[PDB]
Design a protein around this ligand. Structure first.
Ligand SMILES: Cc1cn([C@H]2C[C@H](OP(=O)(O)O)[C@@H](COP(=O)(O)O)O2)c(=O)[nH]c1=O
Ligand SMILES: [Ca+2]
Length: 129
């Protein structure tokens, strides 16, 4: 997999944001995770976590997996990096997302994320508290 450039247009919630990619605006949905909705418990905390990470980054990058690059809603499906740190992983490590939506052929980072989830759960963080 390869990292590609994008710029933040606006934060949306814990697992989506509007980015400019190849010069076009797109909503991106993080691969392999599920954050609570803003109206759910830990929703506002997930939204704030991703917002800070993406708004504070000097450099945002998107990394597509080997399979589908857009979902049925026209959202980009990617691993997102903020100054080299993967947002998807960071959310899971903090207990603010669960590993989820692991479709075959788009699951390169599954084991990395499951290890983070196991650590979050061991620490009883947030969703696991
Ligand atoms: C994360 C992801 C979600 N989706 C679709 C599945 C779910 O369809 P349904 O909308 O029919 O439930 C929806 C979940 O996204 P959200 O968690 O953003 O709602 O997005 C994919 O198709 N591929 C993916 O990799
Ligand atoms: Ca969600």
């Amino acid at each position: 997999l390869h990292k590609e450039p994008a710029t933040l247009i606006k934060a949306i919630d814990g697992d989506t944001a509007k980015l400019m990619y190849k010069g076009q605006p797109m909503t991106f949905r993080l691969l392999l995770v599920d954050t609570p909705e803003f109206n759910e418990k830990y929703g506002p905390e997930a939204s704030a976590f991703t917002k800070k990470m993406v708004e504070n980054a000097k450099k945002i990058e998107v990394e597509f997996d080997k399979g589908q690059r857009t979902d049925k809603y026209g959202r980009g499906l990617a691993y997102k990096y903020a100054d080299g740190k993967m947002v998807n992983e960071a959310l899971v490590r903090q207990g603010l997302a669960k590993v989820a939506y692991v479709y075959k052929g788009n699951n390169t980072h599954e084991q990395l994320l499951r290890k983070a989830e196991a650590q979050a759960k061991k620490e009883k963080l947030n969703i696991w508290s």
